[model samples]
Target: VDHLPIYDLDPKLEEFKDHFNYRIKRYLDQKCLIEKHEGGLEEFSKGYLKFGINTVDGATIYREWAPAAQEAQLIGEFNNWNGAKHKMEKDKFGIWSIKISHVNGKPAIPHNSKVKFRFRHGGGAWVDRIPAWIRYATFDASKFGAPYDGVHWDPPACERYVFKHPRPPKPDAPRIYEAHVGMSGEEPEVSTYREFADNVLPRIRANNYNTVQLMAIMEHSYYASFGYHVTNFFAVSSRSGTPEDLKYLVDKAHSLGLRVLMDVVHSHASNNVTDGLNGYDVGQNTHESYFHTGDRGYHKLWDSRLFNYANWEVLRFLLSNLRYWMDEFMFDGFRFDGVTSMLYHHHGINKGFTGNYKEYFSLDTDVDAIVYMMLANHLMHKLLPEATIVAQDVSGMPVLCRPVDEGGVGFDFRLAMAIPDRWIDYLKNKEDRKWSMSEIVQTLTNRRYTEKCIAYAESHDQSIVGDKTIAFLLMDKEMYTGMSDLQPASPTINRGIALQKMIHFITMALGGDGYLNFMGNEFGHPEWIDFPREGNNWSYDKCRRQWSLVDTDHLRYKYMNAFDQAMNALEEEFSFLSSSKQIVSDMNEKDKVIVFERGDLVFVFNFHPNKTYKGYKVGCDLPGKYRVALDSDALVFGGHGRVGHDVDHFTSPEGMPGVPETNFNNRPNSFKVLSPPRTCVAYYRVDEDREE
Candidate 1:
């Protein structure tokens, strides 16, 4: 104290003290400013053209936002597709504006009239073009020309029907069945939207799923890219029927009490320079300045162009596109794809997130991108409160599911992205005994406290080419031979069937708030998903789900399907899984056993390949008679009948002479049971007092 008084504290500590304090204060101030001005950076840009016909007033207006265009003309059905009659006038902003009061003394450009513009841009050739706002587009593989021609494209008004009522209330614990309409049908070629609505909708509902996540709804030039190479954001893919057909699909799903979530690709744009927004009018910076320059602009992994979030016009284009999907098509929500790439400059390549807070706030991170997501989530929730916005991000970004106003980036849920990777890693590297129970539990149950997540053992990502599905890894080549129920057991089929039930059961019970299953995974669909790539001579053999296998009574595959149905039914019965706390009661690293309790139900798993435990004493809170409600070893699910299905345990009475009365072990109060290997069982406490 005497030394502090003698020396001036400010002068002695000034040099070293200010260094840490200055940086901390600066960071805090920047973060606060970012929070305040979130989503406030962008303004709406006016559209180039507004084309419509007035039926009563007999008038038509055609406006274009080409300030530098020397001349423009309307050419369509009304004028016998003539390119010279309706000349347009240029305005101050280089916009071409024209008004036609009457055509043939009646009215100009009547309803459902096909139209296009012939414009001269910067002394270039006179090019016939479809309006940017046109909702219909098509491509002919024979001609190899532009997507759509004005003369052949006028969609009927009756096809653009909207929903008459509010969407039905979604399930509290939604089980999403992810699908792609183009690849759903058995045909090698593309499938239509109407076909999926009629054929696949019933399959999804029969499987007890309440939601469907559709992929590749947006228009893309290349069919092989799986609709990721988006060209026209506003137009639905013409490959899958007209826009009205898409609306019908949504209407049908809503009527069946199923919500649809589209796979939205906002991380990057296609590199097509002419048809796409990139270099549309022969100007490099027209939309190029809004993207990264040179190599940085290119997505090395996906071979796509990265969008610049700092551009106001680009933001408006994307945000408005999102609104169009919800308002026009009646999509319940979106699963934002490639979000990890948008969050960081590295695109999450070669980056390992170790739960470090400092890594999230790195300089490589784009704050503008975060702000854009915040805005998108806010707008989606504002428009549709029941609408879900999911982030397909592997990075553990805190507060992704939190409310935007409460210092969080709003999202209804984040896909439990680690589950697929963990399952793959275990299958590829670990043996049965070598598998760690602690790591499995941590991987399945580990998540942010405040955020909600949708979990699955594996999805389409794990089944893609060069990789394998969980079933393929477990059963290997034997899947081709040992799949029939009549065949004797093989080591491969045994392990595959056992693990398939355990994996799905644990994931649904402990993984997250909701569950998901890729198409065909419920029945252990064999082989990997390869979408006609060059590796195997563009084969569609592995691309489609073999539904016939599950339908045949001779195959054990139907047993897996039966097990899945039972699991879903049991989950519905115990509604507490939606709110119950998942607690690990015991985890044996050596024996590969894990016991966990949720609400009044206890789930005990014996993953040991051959080692069955006798008198396994798992602790429970519910002090009543416990009975086995479900067992994986039942013959219905392709397992040997190991445990007695009708047995019930009772705890010991109180104050019995020479009887152990501890809570851990007591008759008619607490007791233990023998757990079989390669099995999972659920126990429910029976209440004697409630039976009046």
Candidate 2:
């Protein structure tokens, strides 16, 4: 508390310095205990390598933590599913372990074979469950709604997928592609990790996205849960492929210079006793073993079980889970899912955060969870300095992205959740002509000082079944009938395309420190994602990405795709995200225009529906010759080509004689350009190499 710099970022946070001190104290206390007792956080997180089913020195070793279990035994394919022959010894700490030597020159547990732990609950009922730390898990496709089965996963040395590429260095300005491997392919059925690597990774690289945020990698029994209801935290979703396949995917992404970020659901886990971490310690109804005892353990809206972060073993298990992915699969970092739920007792359910200090520091704040996050962030940073940890919190918690040592929860970035919501709201409730330029700029630029945010116009949330994608909301059924280039573009299609480009550009330019786009949203993929479920008779029709739409020559989707590429290209050429100096030079209500300067580049957006200005003047930071860096009205991006690409415009000094501008919008220099209606254009200084 003496010199914690977070308070300096916001004067309002000075009042909460005591709260920050308490949080930091708890974190240090936890870390000190871990170091004093369990070697250190690093060694403790290595629990996965020790606790799970591991093959070592020509023997099969299995370990489990079941504190509430009266008895335990090893049960698997090798023993004919009978645990009577193989009993496990339980330590005083409730760790049950067993080591089986080779059976006639072969390993005791067969590779990729079934395995389970037979144990007697404290209630005296005998039950079987997959190991909590199982690396490979799968479900029987032959049986509907079948529980997951743990696999030995002891692949021979020759068959293992060794990583060929080192992870790409952390990007200063992460252009993240939020992707789902299962729904990556053009096929309706669930796609494989290898398929995603071969197909999707290329597209992401082509689009110039520096990071790949993969969703639904962890094993979940319910496919419709979209990987949120994780049954096996340590296991890769076998529906995608084996663990080795995932390694290949990450390696491939690294080869393409794209760092991969996994969607880690540490907020809560699946409420399944059979294969999940729900009742592993045998307190079925109470869930006192791994989770909280009463209603606090349950997430009502999500129908999931929350973690008891205070517990020592729980910390080890959860912390180890994070390490396992980074160490084993070579994931660059994690997009921590549902962080708002994790940090509060109400789980962000109907608790509208008013950005008040009381809302964040009150008794409702889950201090234990915050401590866990702090520990996790500290561990991740210490372990991998380049690790990009992004928290998905909608609560607008102050200092959430600052360093843990600064009395704050360390995260590289927090998702700009409001940007997408505002964009969706405007598109859903307001007409294009009625859209407020000032409100749009405010939503995009609003953020806690110095805390980086990943701004997205839309993510997987908007693409889910209940909601419509930015594209679908704009075009509707016209996507089906009006997508062909052979036919003249409909008014609806024209407006949709223009608005979509404008929305994405403005959000990226003005929103936050980084930019993100969901898999198919780059090309304006026209559909909602509804995974296989009973609601639609387990249909895959709406689950998969329609890549063919963009691939087809005569489709209008290619235009959006080209524009997205150009946008990325512009960002790559000029690193706007790295620059913290973003100034909205102008936001005119009457003209429906918004102008901003970032990374020495001038961006002018004309939101007027049908009012194209011949000589639209905007402010600039530098008085020099400027050229069009990126134009949404380019002919290749399905635009009218109203703005010229070859023309070089010169910026005039403010208050100069014969200059029409009385005052340049908060800048020393000004530039005039042919602004097209519903179009956004970025201009770069051509007089000198200002990008450096």
Candidate 3:
């Protein structure tokens, strides 16, 4: 066959031809590569599917997929350590099955009974195991140490906490709080679910956030990976308290009017052979075919295994996992992670998304993975109509938040994942005068018209050790010494504090239907986030948030926190943010001034390093007196205490009888105290009569 002409190929086709067939196909292959080597996606959906021990039935049908095992047996509290007492038979489909008709002199396994299994893998290690469906399991790192056994699986009589009120229709504007329970505490050690429930929940509510997106809730083998290296799909991380405690946390959040959402990492798994799914059944072909056979199965960058969504067993495993989290944990929704990795063969590494629809439907697009996400979204809404599902995708995948039946993935929202990088890149490479107002607005507002999104200035991604937070980028090393109220103002501190407030406000105001702030970011938390990795000598210093800084009366942190609280409060009051659109009137690169309107409010930003404009003019659709509703330069937000807190309105001036007036000559309907450098101000127009 003649070779295809490279010149005739689509521009988008060039990058993929060098790597994979289509960008999306690369994502699928990468997913399978990671799953086969890693334990696979931590079954967040499985946590929602609950198994009940029915007393009416004479037997307990102990069923699980173990195609890799040579033989399987049911062993539990009743077996008394005997492996042969309950040998399971293999089905036609290779799923090992066993039914325990009698246990402990009873007709079936009793309620709250502890159970496990024995699997003879390759006839070598006859490993006794806990059913992969077990919701609660524990481990003692110092005692049992690696290769975590399922013996500690226990069925606790968890309190059935019911909601008296139906969940409110998820807010059109979701203010999401992205949190990590393990790193939530003030102490250096791992934090428990109870601690998050007790401490973090109140803080979230106090900050006026309506949603909490929890990360790393599922069981993972490596702590350093931050729960991405999931080994056991069904178990909650034993690093936190038991699964019941996790449920209690969710229940508590709901009681406080906060919706809890889990960050579901379904894209890949850890590659650990012994402890993870790499050799889970101790056979090569068990879960193997469900993954790529060899090198194609490994994620080169993340060093994880990709899952084969094409496999029926894998589908069942994953779909069931989706249902589990909703049913068991009472989570309002999920934030699906690494979706770009799942959608393409090359995992979107070094790919430029030029926004061509053809690029999305190309061969690199894993139709199977797409179908799976579509199905999962449908399944979640079917089970819980009020549930919300979000996709954290950077690829600008269309239909991510669209309805499934409409030939789209039925996610309620997609993370505005590109905003953080855009902000960081500009902050790093461009000087204040060179910053592009038009591009900033475009990045923040550019999203699928058909889909909803959760927007953020930055999340955990920007805080990773080598990377810098918006604050650190602005202030750098000076943050430690320049944060004091007593010290002379440093330009770094001033600019950092000013931009921090403006960035968050603008992001929330114009970016998406929802908003998100990573833990501690609201208070301009300094330092990068680095887990207990070897590079830092296993230090937790950078792992935790310094709440003390914000809690103290220090001006810098205090101002950041105050501005954050105000932003959230505005979100709560306006409720119109989701429906509002950003209307830009002017953008001047030389003056570093930008003006945009959303709903009835006007936002003006001045990013010039030193210049301030006098009598700056901009167009507004409404003609009325306007008052300064919120100003970033206010002293409360760590500014120079420049602008007055009181409201100031504009007075329409009558044209001089003799002077000729033009369309642009309408003067002084509103007046603004000159916007400060690196500051943003929001003004609300008041009717002429109410201006007094």
lDDT of every predicted structure (CA atoms): 0.72, 0.87, 0.72
- CA displacement after TM-score superposition, residue 260 of candidate 3 (Å): 1.2
| Residues 1-692 of candidate 2: C-alpha lDDT, one tens digit per residue | 16578767778877876777777788999999999998888888898889988778988788898877778888889999888878999898888998999999999888989988888876676788888888889887779868788898979899899999998988879999998888888888989999999988999999889999999998888887878899988899998899999999999999999999999999888887777877474454332377876677785656588788898888999999999999989999999999999889987789887777898887888899999998999889988999999999989788889998877898889999888788778878997778888898889888875788999999987665378898989999889989999988988899899989999998898888899999999999987888777789988999889888999999999999999998998898889988887989788899899889988788989988788888788888778898999999998999999898879899887875444456576677888899978899999888676555
Count steric clashes of candidate 1.
10
Regions more than 4 Å wrong, model 1:
1-121, 126-132, 141-154, 162-166, 279-281, 284-296, 299-301, 651-671, 687-691
Query: How does model 2 score by TM-score?
Result: 0.96
TM-score of each: 0.84, 0.96, 0.85
Candidate 1 clashing pairs? Answer: 66-94, 67-94, 650-668, 651-667, 651-668, 651-669, 652-666, 652-667, 652-668, 652-669
Writing each residue's lDDT as its tens digit, candidate 3 over 1-692 gives 22223213234334434333332343445446545754343442342222312233655665656766778777766666665877878777667666567666655554444666678777587776556555555556665346565533335344543444334467657888999888888788788899998988888888889999999987787877777777767778888877777878888888788888897888887776555555453436524445665665775756487887867667767777777777777888898888998888878878888987566667677766776786677678878888889887889776566665443567888888889988898889987767888898898888765568888998887665368888898888888888998776777787788888888888888888889999999988888888876788877887777778888884468888888888787768766467655676667767888787777777788888887776666545456667777888877777776665565656444443334363223322334456767788877776667545
Looking at model 3, residue 686 earns an lDDT score of: 64
Least lDDT summed over 10 consecutive residues: which range in candidate 3? 47-56
Between candidates 1 and 3, the one scoring higher on TM-score is 3
Q: Which is better, 1 or 2, measured by TM-score?
A: 2
